[PDB]
Ligand binder design. Structure first.
Ligand SMILES: Nc1ncnc2c1ncn2[C@@H]1O[C@H](COP(=O)(O)OP(=O)(O)OP(=O)(O)O)[C@@H](O)[C@H]1O
Ligand SMILES: Nc1ncnc2c1ncn2[C@@H]1O[C@H](COP(=O)(O)OP(=O)(O)OP(=O)(O)O)[C@@H](O)[C@H]1O
Ligand SMILES: Cc1cn([C@H]2C[C@H](O)[C@@H](COP(=O)(O)OP(=O)(O)OP(=O)(O)O)O2)c(=O)[nH]c1=O
Ligand SMILES: [Mg+2]
Ligand SMILES: [Mg+2]
Ligand SMILES: [Mn+2]
Ligand SMILES: [Mn+2]
Ligand SMILES: [Mn+2]
Ligand SMILES: [Mn+2]
Lengths: 289, 683, 289, 683
């Protein structure tokens, strides 16, 4: 009942980072403190890693196991967006704002950062555990994918949105909003596929799947807290970002058909502000009136 | 999102099944309560403001020095006494984003609407305080609007030229081509749109110094001009805009047209160079009879006859060209060429169409020259003489290059004030002043023709707005009756003002004695046909205003015979792109494209309803695409019969209609006397 | 040396089925004979069936085994074009020209057809034989992929191009030309990835891989000749189609860095009408002599 | 296939393991007994031939009218008395395909080699029968070869200009840019290669009258010039060739270089305009020390100091530019810029490299101006003053735009005849005549510089041919000793002829008094150092000829001080591309690219062995790519020490070597005093 409308929405949302000129951010970037620039680079690098694996591994593997040519076409399109559009856009931002050495250093930093490695290990592990014709392993990977789309990106998205909302780094911010618009529909779509599998189960099996989903969310959440503190303490925003990731965790649960898990909190209003023609021959009668 | 933008977007939100048009007014208030007043620089008195603007190189000292400070203060007080309020948010937004003077840092507003109007009036009057107050009352009543160059730049030291329509004749030589490129660059630097006639240039495969197959044709010249216009782009502010016109009997006409095809290669297609095609009546006759036509090599014709192909009447010269063995020509199918024109206009809106004989059968200055091409907006139609730019240390033969002076009457505001005569005469005086104060030191033929011809273009706008707010359909015969009467009065008072200026200054335009004004032929249709309204509704619209009769036209003809006419050309209807927003008017005499237009500024959306749009006149504000293009052609021809120059006439087509329909509209325009066709905008 | 350049060319060639209006083809379709309509339907179904294998298996399997983030992104983009753009385009052409029952019957026929099946299963067999971390098996699959993209499609493309060059079925011919333009670049790109593997091999292993490629080409070519006669004899075109197959076989070989196998031949004019030195840093003391 | 084509292809068919070089001779015989003699047009006598060529607008009658027909007959008889035979098929083929005069339809041959030489000699002599015979003997012996423009066009009615290269200075203004485009088109129409110095143009992101970030930089002017050269392409016969030169300290230097990158976008890529980079010693010093350099905005420097950035010495003003806050600059890595230059030269052979300090440390006319750029072949290095092209109706300040006439000595034929002095003096006289009869009516600065500077270029060809045919390795120290002695003799006799012309005409070149010729500084190294051969073999090679000593140089210095010099510049070694074929000579002073070159003409292929190639001198004809580029740099520096202008020095590189090797070669060239580097041709 939904794939065709998602197909149409995904293809109509198609974009490339080159559509957005980035040289306009040069001055507001220059004006940020060293702490702010550091957090910003690292935040986008963490996002780049997530999209790299979502494009290389997550979306293609889910596409392989989901039945139906139209469902596969949507998932293939989403996969392309992840690595050919989203992951690449971050390099466009980096290449504009930062010198090569700072770019090299931040990519080295992703490799050695323990929270980023842990979250990649956990998510990709679940993708690679999918067994052919085994719907339960597929469900588990789809939960992981929804958590990546609708929860894990948000510790990263906070900062570009926070600046966009203050009228700073607005070209980079425009790119990020386009990425976010895509991930929102990706999270909903994968969520609907996960619910399909969940709804086939006995009540006993469903109870276990909810346990899996909640245990996984809590494990990812605890790691994300440490990641958030590590990045945001130097810019004074860790508590604010934490509220934002809890907000989005609830959206991820809802995408999976589950009740919200965290209590509602006031999000920084700045971040909320951050959101050929047919041819006929001429007759002799067309020359007279 | 700012408060005024929310109030503007609340228009589309329907209450009781109706658009909240009145909310737009509230938006304006917000746009002034929250933004404009906060970012407007205020001074203790006008003396301090004028001193700050003059000292900081914002204004010019010369035009302000012609008045005492008391007179300038009185003019400003007259401007502010109207208490003018922008009726829509987009009017104020467009003025304060495009025309209001801002500081060098572009964060503060130095000029209000009244300040800009007062400065333009003081510039117009050239030292006459009463004339300046008359101009202030004209512009604050929004009866007359100087063009974007004049309105934006009048009285400003950091400014471009007040003229932005330039027509250049290019002679068939490398020296002339290089000079044309240079002049195009210099005029684009001044901020003007440049149109070049390429018909005199010899086609591809012609001889240079008696070596065969040497000429690159007009397409290489178009590539050079396109590069020149890309380079000269108003100091990196606007994209350099240029137009190239070629006669349809030029052999390069296909390659010319091929420059606008999407499939054209990078060495063929020109992207920033608009193209227009001049279509003589002979081509239309050949297409009508399905006889195969001939496209001629211009240099062979020049060698055989001593004159350029576009300098002689093709109606009487075509058979002689065809029968002449020394004239080289190529066989073409005129109907295929017409279909190609229609297809290209469907794809990209190009080329502009100039019906040469439609222009020249009513041209008053055929003795000086026949109108061979039009401007970038395809509404300037004037006599031009090519210049012979010789080698270095050799005297050039300077010809006439067209550069007319733009200004538009607001038909709604003019007619509701019952001031057709006063507005037309004051606009003519302002256009004469701007033409006299224009001095271009890098375009010799443009300067010479400005000094000699003294040609101005007085246009009109808000025709569809006025008709819709008066319960008249744009396609109705009553609308055409009103256009006929209104533009006949405009022509009458423009001719009267031109003759009065000629009598006062004791001089006419150069070669006026050979014009149809001097011989009285121009007034023939005016001394025999009565142009009073034939409908009671239109007559009641014209109530309170004297409508010139045949006796009045005879008196005007005698006055012109006795005193002459100061302007070679007076009236031309320009598109009026952005000034129509500030004046809260529909663009030009064209019908409206949309009832409410959606625009994206920055990352915000904005909504502009057409002026005076409401539930009662929603049906009368018919969109242009929904209209019958034949009736639009009829209205434009009705207006054109009273306009000496052309009218920027854009075709509005649906995606359903084919190239046959476009060709039919073009042929009906040719039949009805339409001089130029501007664009083919497909919905 | 090449992936970013191909990325650019791929993304700038992006298109959607909806851009070409198909209904005006019915004005020439109605004037074709039964044999012409039959051949067209069968050719179209052949292309559709082969392209589906490439979208579901060929491109995604190669993307899975190739190392490199940028290569995976380009390959993902190509897989997207197969599934989201090409497959929808073929379906659109069919739905325009034939009623539902006729489409189902043609696909039933072509699905059972011996020559179509032989080539489809030969290609799919090589994709299924790729082994993790075995570059030889990957190379063999890449050869199969290049043969599909740059060679096997062309016995089919011939007919739409033949009509397109005559002014018949212009809307569907425009679509086919866009598809063909994508397959050409796909073939060139996968060819470069195969040459990279080939160049890492010993001389004996190279000779062995050349023998594999030529042997595979021979098997496919002999089946193409039979496929060609089966479809085109009824419309009298087989001789010219055979020239077109050999010409495209030579292009496929050149994509794999191999010499042409067949002598140069001229192609049907109607179908024709349708159609760095090593950077070494200055080490100082290079300024002193 | 033609019989001569088969005979020429028989060279590569080895007999007894050796090439059949003698077969080449047979080919020429065939080429004459089957094609040339049949396709030639014979007349009853010379009178009918001259009359037919004069009335049919083949020859100018003015230069022939200065001689009685008896004198012309005597000159032609002197030309034909030598019984000149082309020793190779390609020599005759190249002459009769590129330089022999043909009919209007190009079906027959009107000019033989002797006829062409006689006509050129009669044009050179300007009415002197004995001088015409001297020129005939000089050219029929092939001791001297006028450049392709002069040799091809002398005495022809349908001729172009005799000047090969033109160098234009472009001032930083729209008027100057447009004038430069016009002059470039005019000179490409005349057939000459045009070089433009873009270093005065302000960089991208500069202010045009107080509006900032407005300029398009040198890349926009580059695109304009590229389109101009594409349009003016010698009437479609030879592709229009232009050169742009930019100082390496210009801010646009990267974008400049990005015009030649193979990955450049179409809006930046320039394909018909060669690029050259002018590198002062300051840039090399900064790269050597690895200190980050600064590229500068020319307009800020001009505003602060009143002079252009390239108008003053960067070696003394770079620190002042850097420490000046009113000067705008960008940080660059000079070593990275050098590596980019090497990579660009490896990929496409561009840019040309001009070591400005190497040019100006021995430049004799630094008082007039420093040499800021080179020509399209990077061998013309002369003082130029920029022109101030003002607005229309305003007088232009005409500067000096470089232009010199090319002529090459055939080293093998000159030394075989033991006539260095006579050949040099006669070539100087011929080049002086070519300069005197050159009058360009559309390039004012070029005309003024030709009239004032009187600069000529006397080159040399067949250096490698002479060395290989005499058993001397081109890289050997003996070859460099020969080059030193021979070019010191050439410089001595060129200076002597220039001083003699100045004495006989009573006039020197403009501003000669401030030159190093007038002060005697130029002769310093010539009055203290002896340039006689240091090897016995070279001294024997120079036997029968008086090698000037320090005493002869002192006498010449005194003679110059007493009488002055007629020519500001005398010697420049052009590439001599296609005219080297006719002379049976190796191209310029460069080493041969290949021993036997396979060239495809029509559907046939021909093999041209190097002149004098045989079994005994096969390894003396070492290919340039196999040679050490450092020893070639040593040879070029040895020649350059005696050449006042530059030498077109092409680098011949192997594919194996890296960009670091290219950078090392460039830095060694700069260290050794190489003025310019032409091309990086990779095998
Ligand atoms: N629609 C409008 N168009 C133009 N200016 C406006 C508009 N609305 C407000 N302004 C500006 O804001 C000022 C405040 O106008 P407001 O509607 O508050 O009342 P007012 O009686 O006109 O005020 P004031 O004492 O300023 O004359 C106006 O004087 C004018 O300068
Ligand atoms: N290599 C060559 N270079 C120039 N001209 C040549 C050459 N070979 C032949 N010719 C021309 O063709 C003619 C053919 O004559 P050829 O050289 O065979 O000897 P010939 O008849 O004995 O007379 P001669 O050698 O005295 O001219 C020559 O007279 C000359 O005009
Ligand atoms: C007009 C124009 C100039 N330029 C650049 C190229 C010229 O080298 C440079 C100088 O132009 P100028 O012709 O000297 O402009 P100007 O004299 O009015 O301004 P200024 O007083 O500052 O000299 O500006 C552009 O890049 N684009 C343009 O459209
Ligand atoms: Mg001429
Ligand atoms: Mg200037
Ligand atoms: Mn993503
Ligand atoms: Mn996603
Ligand atoms: Mn496909
Ligand atoms: Mn494919």
């Amino acid at each position: 009942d939904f794939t065709q409308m998602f197909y149409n929405q995904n293809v109509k949302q198609f974009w490339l980072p080159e559509e957005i000129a980035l040289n306009g951010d040069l001055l507001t970037w220059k004006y940020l403190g060293k702490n702010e620039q550091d957090t910003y680079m690292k935040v986008l690098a963490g996002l780049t890693l997530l999209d790299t694996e979502q494009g290389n591994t997550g979306m293609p593997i889910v596409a392989e196991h989901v039945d139906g040519h139209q469902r596969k076409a949507v998932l293939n399109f989403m996969a392309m967006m992840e690595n050919a559009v989203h992951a690449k856009s971050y390099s466009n931002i980096f290449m504009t704002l930062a010198p090569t050495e700072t770019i090299n250093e931040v990519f080295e930093w992703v490799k050695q950062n323990k929270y980023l490695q842990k979250k990649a290990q956990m998510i990709v592990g679940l993708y690679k555990a999918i067994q052919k014709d085994d719907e339960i392993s597929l469900f588990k990977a789809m939960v992981a994918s929804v958590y990546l789309e609708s929860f894990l990106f948000y510790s990263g998205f906070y900062y570009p949105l926070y600046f966009y909302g203050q009228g700073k780094l607005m070209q980079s911010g425009e790119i990020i909003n386009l990425i976010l618009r895509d991930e929102a529909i990706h999270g909903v779509y994968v969520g609907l596929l996960a619910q399909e599998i969940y709804n086939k189960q006995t009540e006993e099996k469903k109870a276990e799947l909810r346990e899996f989903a909640i245990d996984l969310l809590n494990q990812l959440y605890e790691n994300e807290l440490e990641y958030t503190e590590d990045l945001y303490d130097q810019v004074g925003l860790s508590h604010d970002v934490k509220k934002f990731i809890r907000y989005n965790a609830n959206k991820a649960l809802m995408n999976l058909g589950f009740d919200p898990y965290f209590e509602e909190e006031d999000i920084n209003p700045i971040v909320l502000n951050g959101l050929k023609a047919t041819v006929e021959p001429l007759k002799d009668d067309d020359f007279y009136f | 999102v700012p408060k005024w933008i929310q109030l503007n977007n609340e228009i589309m939100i329907q209450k009781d099944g109706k658009f909240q048009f009145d909310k737009d007014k509230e938006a304006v208030h917000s746009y002034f309560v929250d933004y404009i007043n906060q970012n407007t620089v205020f001074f203790h008195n006008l003396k301090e403001k004028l001193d700050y603007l003059v000292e900081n190189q914002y204004y010019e000292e010369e035009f302000l020095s012609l008045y005492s400070f008391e007179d300038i203060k009185e003019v400003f007080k007259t401007a502010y006494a109207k208490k003018f309020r922008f009726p829509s948010f987009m009017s104020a937004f467009k003025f304060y984003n495009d025309y209001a003077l801002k500081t060098n840092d572009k964060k503060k507003i130095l000029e209000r609407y009244e300040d800009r109007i007062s400065i333009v009036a003081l510039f117009f009057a050239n030292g006459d305080t009463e004339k300046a107050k008359e101009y202030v009352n004209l512009m604050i009543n929004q009866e007359y609007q100087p063009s974007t160059p004049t309105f934006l730049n009048a009285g400003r030291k950091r400014r471009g030229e007040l003229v932005s329509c330039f027509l250049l004749e290019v002679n068939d030589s490398l020296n002339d081509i290089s000079r044309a490129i240079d002049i195009s660059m210099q005029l684009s630097k001044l901020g003007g749109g440049v149109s070049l006639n390429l018909s005199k240039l010899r086609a591809k495969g012609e001889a240079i110094k008696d070596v065969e197959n040497a000429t690159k044709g007009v397409v290489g010249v178009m590539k050079l001009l396109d590069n020149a216009f890309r380079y000269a782009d108003q100091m990196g502010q606007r994209q350099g805009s240029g137009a190239a016109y070629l006669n349809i009997f030029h052999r390069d006409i296909n390659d010319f047209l091929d420059t606008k095809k999407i499939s054209a290669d990078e060495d063929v297609r020109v992207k920033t160079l608009s193209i227009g095609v001049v279509i003589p009546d002979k081509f239309v006759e050949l297409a009508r009879e399905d006889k195969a036509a001939y496209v001629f090599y211009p240099h062979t014709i020049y060698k055989e006859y001593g004159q350029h192909m576009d300098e002689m009447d093709m109606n009487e010269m075509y058979d002689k060209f065809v029968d002449n063995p020394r004239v080289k020509k190529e066989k073409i199918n005129p109907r295929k060429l017409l279909e190609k024109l229609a297809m290209l206009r469907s794809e990209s809106g190009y080329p502009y169409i100039m019906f040469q004989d439609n222009v020249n059968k009513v041209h008053a200055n055929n003795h000086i020259s026949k109108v061979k091409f039009s401007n970038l907006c395809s509404e300037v139609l004037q006599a031009s003489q090519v210049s012979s730019y010789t080698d270095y240390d050799e005297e050039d033969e300077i010809g006439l290059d067209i550069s007319c002076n733009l200004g538009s009457l607001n038909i709604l505001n003019v007619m509701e004030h019952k001031s057709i005569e006063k507005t037309v005469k004051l606009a003519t005086d302002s256009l004469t002043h701007v033409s006299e104060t224009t001095d271009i030191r890098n375009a010799p033929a443009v300067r010479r023709a400005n000094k000699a011809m003294k040609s101005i273009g007085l246009g009109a706008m808000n025709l569809h707005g006025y008709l819709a707010q008066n319960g008249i359909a744009y396609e109705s015969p009553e609308a055409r009756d009103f256009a006929n009467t209104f533009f006949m009065m405009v022509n009458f008072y423009s001719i009267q003002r031109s003759a009065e200026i000629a009598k006062e200054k004791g001089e006419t335009f150069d070669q006026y004695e050979g014009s149809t004004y001097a011989t009285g032929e121009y007034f023939d249709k005016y001394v025999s046909t009565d142009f009073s309204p034939k409908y009671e509704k239109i007559a009641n619209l014209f109530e309170g205003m004297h409508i010139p009769t045949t006796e009045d036209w005879k008196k005007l003809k005698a006055f012109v015979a006795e005193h002459g006419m100061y302007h070679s050309y007076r009236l031309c209807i320009a598109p009026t792109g952005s000034i129509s927003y500030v004046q809260s008017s529909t663009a030009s005499v064209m019908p409206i494209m949309e009832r409410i237009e959606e625009r994206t500024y920055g990352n915000s959306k904005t909504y502009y309803p057409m002026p005076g749009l409401a539930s009662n006149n929603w049906f009368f504000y018919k969109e242009a695409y929904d209209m019958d293009m034949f009736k639009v052609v009829d209205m434009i021809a009705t207006i054109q019969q009273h306009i000496d120059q052309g009218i920027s006439f854009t075709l509005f087509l649906k995606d359903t209609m084919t190239t046959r329909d476009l060709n039919r509209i073009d042929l009906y325009a040719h039949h009805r006397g339409i001089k130029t066709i501007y664009y083919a905008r497909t919905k």
